[model samples]
Target: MSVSDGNGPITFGSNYSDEAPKAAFASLMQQATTSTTVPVTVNTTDHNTFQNNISNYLQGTPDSLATWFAGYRLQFFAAQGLLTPIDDVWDKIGGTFNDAAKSLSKGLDGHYYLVPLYNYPWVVFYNKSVFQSKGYEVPASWEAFIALARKMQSDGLVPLAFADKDGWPALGTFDILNLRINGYDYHIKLMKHEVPWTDPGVTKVFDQWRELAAYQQKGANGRTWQDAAKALENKQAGMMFQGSNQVAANYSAKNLPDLDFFVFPAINPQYGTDYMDAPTDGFILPKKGKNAAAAKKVLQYIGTAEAEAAFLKTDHWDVGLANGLIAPTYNDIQKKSVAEIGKCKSVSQFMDADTVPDMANAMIKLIQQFIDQPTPETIATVQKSAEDQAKTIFR
Candidate 1:
C-alpha cells in the first residue's frame, strides 16, 4: 500500500511532543529500536494536533508507525483501508498480550491493528498531603463526593482541577459520569450510536455530571490538563479527574510519593463503581508507511512485556496490559490504579478513543460548552449535535 519503497528506517508519527513526556518518549524509542536494523525515526507533534489531525496525516504520509489508541479509533482507520493490518506481527507476539489487550488491538473485521504499550485508568487523583493537611476523607458515593467538594470549597481549595483547552480532559469527566449513570452496556450502545442520543438516560448522566462538575476550576476552556495538574501539585486544587498517565507531570523525585488516587466513587447503587475509562495507547502501522517489514519487526518486539516494562521504567507508566507483566517497583498511586482497573467490571477507552473522530471533534466542543455553561438542556443539545454528526460519520 505504500507509495514508497516500504523498506527504510521505520518512521514514527508520534503524539508525545509535549514537554511533560518527551524524555520518557525518547527513552522508549531508544530502547525499542536497539535490536532492529531499520531503526525508528520519530516526527513529533503536539498531542492535540496529532489526535485531531490524524486522518489527514495518515491520508497524506503517515510514518511506518503512528502512536495511537485502541478501540473504535483504531478500527475506524482499519475499516477505511488507511491502516496496515499487523496480524502477521501479532501472530508472533500475540501471546504477550492479555485477552483484553489483544481484542483492543483488533479491527471490527477481527484483524490486529495495534501493538499495545500501556492501558491506564482515568481516576480522581489528589495530593496526599493536601488531604491530610485539610483532614478530608475519600468519598464512597455521589452524595459524599459532593459533600467533600463542598468542604474543599469552604476550606478555600479549588474542589476539582479541570482543563479542556487541549480538548480531551473533559472526556474523563463525561466518561465516568456516563458509565456511572447509564451503566456499561448502555454506554456501549451510546458510543456505537445503536442507542439514540436524545435518550433521557444520557440526560440523567449530564444532570449527574453537572452536579459534580460544578466543582471544577472555573475558566476550564482556557486551561490545559498539564496546567491543571500543576494546580494539584501546587496544592491550589483539591482533586482532579485525570488519566493516571499525568501523575508524574509536575511531580519531582522527592514529592512524587505524595500523589495518591481513588477510584471514582459510586453513583447508582445498582451499578456501583464498576466502570472506568481505561484507554490503551499503542502503535499502529499505516498503509502509507515506507517500511512495512521493519515496522512489523518493531511492533513484534514492542508488543512484549519486557519492552513495555522497560519503557515504563522511565515514563512512570502505571499499567501495562501485557500478559504476565508485573510492574517493576510501582508507587502507591500506580498500585491502586492497577488493582482498581483489574476489578472494574467494564472499561471504555477514553470517550474520544472509543468513538469516531468526526463525532469526537464535535463532541469535545459540545462537552466543553457544557463545562463552560451547564444546564438541564445540555444533554439534549449534545444529543442533537451527535445525532446530526452521526449521520455523516457513521456512514
Candidate 2:
C-alpha cells in the first residue's frame, strides 16, 4: 500500500527496501502512541521530478516551502488540519536541538519546525607530510597562509586544491573569508540584509575573495571536489578547504596518516577566533503524513542521546544536536576539530543554505564569473546583482 496527497502519484512502503531510511523511519514509528501501517509508494520515476512536483503542490499552502521541506513536516500537517499540534511533544524534544536546528525550526514565526539529523563543519585539510617536508606549520592567520602558499608553489606543489565544478566548494571558501574578514556578527547581518551588499564591509569581503582565488590550485577550473580530494591524496596539493565528511573518504588505508585537518586561518587578529561553517542534514515530519502522532514521537526519539550517538558513529561527522555525543574511533585531529568548533563563540551555516536560495544562486554565478575574469567590472557586477537581490529580502 501507499500514501498519496491527491496532486501527484503515491509513495509506497515497499520502495524503501534499503535499511537506512527504513530503519530511520522504523525507529521513529516505534516511539509513536498509535502507529499506522500504511505503505509508502515511491514513484520510481525521476526523484528530482517527483520532489519538484510535490513542492509545487505544496506551494502557498500556509507555510513556506523552506519550512515544509526543511523540518516542519508537522507544521504543514497541523495547518492543513491533518494533524493536531502537540505542544507536549515539542516541549519534550525542543531542548535537544542545537542553534542551527532551532533556526531551521523557527520558520519566520519563531515556532519549532523541524529536527536536524546530521551536520558537519567545513575545514581545511592538509597533507601533514607535505607540510613537514616544506618546514611549514599550520597557519594561524591568512597572511601566514599566503606566505605558505608561495612556499608550496616554490617547492613545486599546488598550494590549494578546489573543485570549482562543484560551485559550493568555492562558495564555502568565500563564506569563510567573509566571516574571517568581517566578524561573524557582521557576516550574519549582511546575510540577513541588515547590512547592504554594497556596504564597505561586504565589498571588502568580495575583494578579499578575489585575491584568495589567485592562490587556488592550477587545474581547479573544471575539476570536481572529489578530484581535488584525490589531488590531496596524491600529495600534488598541499591543502584543501573541505567538509569534515571528506575526511572519511580521503583517510582510508591508502591515504592513512597523510590527512590532517585545521580550521580556516583567521583573516584578522581582532576577529578573535575561527568560525565554523556547518551544514546540517535532518528529518522532517510531513505535515500531511498519515501517522502524525507516531511521526512526532519518532522525531522526539531521534533527538534523544541514543539516536545521536548511533548516527554519529556511522557518519563520523558533526552533530548539530546538543547531545554531547562523540563518535567512536575518531582520530586525534578529528577530535581537535570538534573541540575547535565547540570552542567557537559562534557558528554560521554555509552561505547558500543560510540565505534565500535565489540570492545564493545569483551569488554563485557572480563568483564564478569573477573567477574567470577577475576584473573590477566583474566584481562590481556581482556586487550590484547581490545588492538588487538583497532588496527583495531586506527592508
Best-fitting candidate, scored by lDDT? 1
The clash count for each model shown is 1, 13
lDDT (10s digit) by residue, model 1, range 1-395:
22222345778888988665666767777776776555778889889999889889999988988898877767779889999898888878877765666767888899988888877778888888888888999998988999999999999999998889988778777778888888877887778778877778878878887777679899999998888888988889998888887756567767778888887889889779988888878889899977788788777778887777776775555577765456776666666767777676657887766776567777888888787778876667777887888877777
TM-scores for the candidates = 0.75, 0.74
By summed lDDT, the worst window of 10 consecutive residues in model 1 runs over 1-10
TM-score of structure candidate 1: 0.75
Quote model 2's TM-score.
Answer: 0.74
Deviation from native of the Cα of residue 163 in model 1, angstroms: 4.4
Report how far residue 166 has shifted in candidate 1, in Å: 5.5
Backbone clashes counted, model 1? 1
